[PDB]
């Protein structure tokens, strides 16, 4: 299906270093990843879809450094987003592929906001896809 987030501009709370930029979660490749700084909660990444779009599904392909507690959230702010609406919450994530369908919302930005890690590293996504 049509990934509204592919090669759109992304912003993350931190990155581990060059090569693990936020943008690497939006390139279509499962051999490139965003990775956060390590050893510190929370972390987050959001994508700017470029305009207000209908959104109803997020598909996360986590790397091994996954979030076991995270939320998916949306914002229809026009400027730099600080108003987030949570559409999904878990404390039992186990990484791999999370394919999360929610009641459709109108959104310009979609955020993954992680608070507990499944590893002692950071948070890391091969790909973060959005549909709607």
Written description of the protein model:
The protein is mostly beta strands and about 130 residues long. It has a single domain, classed as Jelly Rolls, CATH 2.60.120.260. The protein is globular, with a radius of gyration of 13 Å.
Short description:
The protein contains no helices and seven strands. With 132 residues, the chain is an all-beta fold.
Instruction: Write out the CATH superfamily name.
Output: Galactose-binding domain-like
The largest sheet, given as strand count, sense and whether it forms a barrel, is: 7 strands, antiparallel
**Strand residue percentage:** over 45%
Please tell me how large the radius of gyration is.
Answer: 13 Å
CATH class: Mainly Beta
- Amount of helix: under 10%
The SSE order reads EEEEEEE
Shape: globular
Number of strands: 7
Structural class: mainly beta
Organism: Paenibacillus fukuinensis
Family: Belongs to the glycosyl hydrolase 8 (cellulase D) family.
Domain F5/8 type C: 3-132
Protein name: Glucanase
Distinctive features:
seven-stranded antiparallel β-sheet; about 0% helix; Jelly Rolls; mainly beta; about 130 residues
Q: Layout of SSEs?
A:
Blueprint (H helix, E strand, L loop, with lengths): L8 E4 L21 E2 L7 E20 L4 E9 L9 E6 L6 E21 L6 E8 L1
Antiparallel strand pairs: 1-3, 2-7, 3-6, 3-7, 4-5, 4-6
Family: Belongs to the glycosyl hydrolase 8 (cellulase D) family.
Organism: Paenibacillus fukuinensis
Protein name: Glucanase
């Amino acid at each position: 299906h049509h990934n509204l987030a592919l090669n759109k501009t992304a912003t993350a709370s931190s990155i581990e270093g060059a090569g693990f930029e936020a943008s690497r979660a939006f390139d279509g490749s499962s051999t490139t990843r965003w990775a956060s700084a390590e050893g510190v909660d929370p972390q987050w990444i959001y994508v700017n879809l470029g305009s207000s779009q209908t959104v109803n599904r997020v598909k996360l392909n986590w790397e091994a450094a996954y979030a076991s507690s995270y939320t998916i959230q949306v914002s229809n702010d026009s400027g730099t987003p600080t108003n987030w609406t949570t559409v999904y919450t878990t404390t039992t994530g186990d990484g791999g592929i999370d394919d999360i369908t929610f009641t459709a919302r109108t959104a310009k930005y979609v955020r993954v906001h992680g608070t507990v890690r499944g590893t002692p590293y950071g948070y890391s996504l091969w790909e973060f896809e959005v549909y709607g």
